[PDB]
Amino acid sequence: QSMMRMMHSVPKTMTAVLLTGHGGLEKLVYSRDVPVPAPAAGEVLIKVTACGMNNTDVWVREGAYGTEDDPSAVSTWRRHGNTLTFPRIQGTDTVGHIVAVGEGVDRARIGERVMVDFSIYNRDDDSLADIDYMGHGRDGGYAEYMALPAENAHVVATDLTDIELATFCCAYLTGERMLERARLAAGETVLVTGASGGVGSAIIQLARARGAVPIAVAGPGKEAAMLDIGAQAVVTRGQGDLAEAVEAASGGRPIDVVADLVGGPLFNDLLKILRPEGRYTTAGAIAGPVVQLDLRTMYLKQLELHGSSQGSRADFRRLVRYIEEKKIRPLVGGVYPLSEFHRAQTDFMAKNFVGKLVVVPD
């Protein structure tokens, strides 16, 4: 109810799931007396109400990004500026309520429901060369409270639940950038692999949002779900030749863009399917990331391959705008209490669900 009580209900210690080093789930410790951060100059402090799970959670913990010299070495994604320090609270897709504010900040902001932009840009221009993110370079949302810069706490003009709002920021920002890098236009066709996953699903929605035609490549039993989120046609990964199946599901239209989230043994086939002068784009490869590329296929077909992470401020604004105009919708695949993080991430890794899993403090 009251704003004053809220301001003074903020405890000195809190509950949080801590990442304590690289390795397996046992490296994630549920702790009961972690210092509540104090908002520095230009920061707010939010009471976390929801936080959405992403692949980067898992890969950062495993150290599964490899290095340029050794693709199987353990490393965080930030290969050249390691800002990961242990213990670290992970969690990128944070929603909460501002309960405290730091030095330069308007005290009128207290009480606001905010969606966190997880991005640390590290530049004033629109370059993505030095990016980092909350949950990697700085503590994230798998805790009861989180500090973050005021500019990053967005008030969204929407009637959605805190949980619903927590589904968007990492995967949909990443989705948008991919679609922007590939220059996907109204009326074009995008083939989306890993379509039932975080980014996959988002791209299907974001494709629709900009007037494009998505065709999902989905696991067995996930077809009807892909249709539900706006896919034009679905191709089941299991059986058949992919190229034939894509041909039939497309009804003949050539594939302008491939959005790949799987990679691995699928990669070469996607380059085969892609129309000449077509564009390939990726921000993750779950199957995975080291592929055999026949340069000749790339240049005889006049192809572009694009790799992309996260997104720009303008991309984020557009995402906020999409949420507000309801051009995309939240996909809640399940909800887990913070106290049951191990169960949450096990379920997360299995991927026997659609859309996104959300972690709530308790």
Q: Tokens in use for 32? A: 């009961």
Residue whose CB is less far from a second copy, 87 or 288? 288
Binding a second copy (rule: CB under 8 A), the pick from 62, 112, 247, 304 is: 304
In the complex, minimum distance from the CB of residue 142 to Cl ion, in angstroms, rounded to a whole number: 22
Is residue 160 within 8 Å of residue 215, measured between CB atoms? no
Binding partner of residue 112 among a second copy, Cl ion, none, CB cut-off 5 to 8 Å per kind: none
Q: Write down the least CB distance from residue 177 to a second copy, Å.
A: 9
Query: In the set 65, 109, 156, 347, which binds a second copy (CB under 8 A)?
Result: 65
DSSP structural state of residue 109? G
How far apart are CB 59 and Cl ion at their closest, in Å?
7
Q: Which of 210, 268, 334, 342 binds a second copy (CB under 8 A)?
A: 268
* Nearest distance from C-beta of residue 187 to a second copy, angstroms: 16
- What is the Cα–Cα distance from 140 to 119, expressed in whole angstroms? 11
What does 291 bind: a second copy, Cl ion, none (CB cut-off 5 to 8 Å by kind)? a second copy
Between the alpha carbon of residue 280 and those of residues 69, 156, 179, 268, 305, the distances in Å are: 25, 32, 10, 11, 5
- What residues have CB less than 8 Å from 250, skipping those under 6 apart? 189, 215, 233
Rounded to whole angstroms, the Cα distance separating 303 from 288 reads 21
Calpha distance 199→173 (Å, rounded): 9
272 versus 321: smaller Cβ distance to a second copy? 272
Q: Could you give the string, one character per residue 271-290, with x where binding to Cl ion holds by CB under 5 A and - elsewhere? A: -------------xx---x-
CA distances from 53 to 149, 199, 341 (A): 21, 12, 10
Of 169, 161, 199, 170, the closest CA to residue 335 belongs to: 161
Residue 149 bridge partners (DSSP): 43
String of contacts with a second copy for each residue 282-301, x by CB under 8 A:
xxxx--xxxxxxxxxxxxxx
Which one of 158, 309, 342, 353 is in contact with a second copy (CB under 8 A)?
309
Determine the residue type at 63. G
307 binds, among a second copy, Cl ion, none (CB under 5 to 8 A by kind): a second copy
**Binders of a second copy: how many residues, by CB under 8 A?**
43
Positions that interact with Cl ion (CB under 5 A): 284-285, 289
Positions that interact with a second copy (CB under 8 A): 65-66, 68, 71, 77, 79, 127-129, 181, 263, 268, 271-272, 275-277, 282-285, 288-309
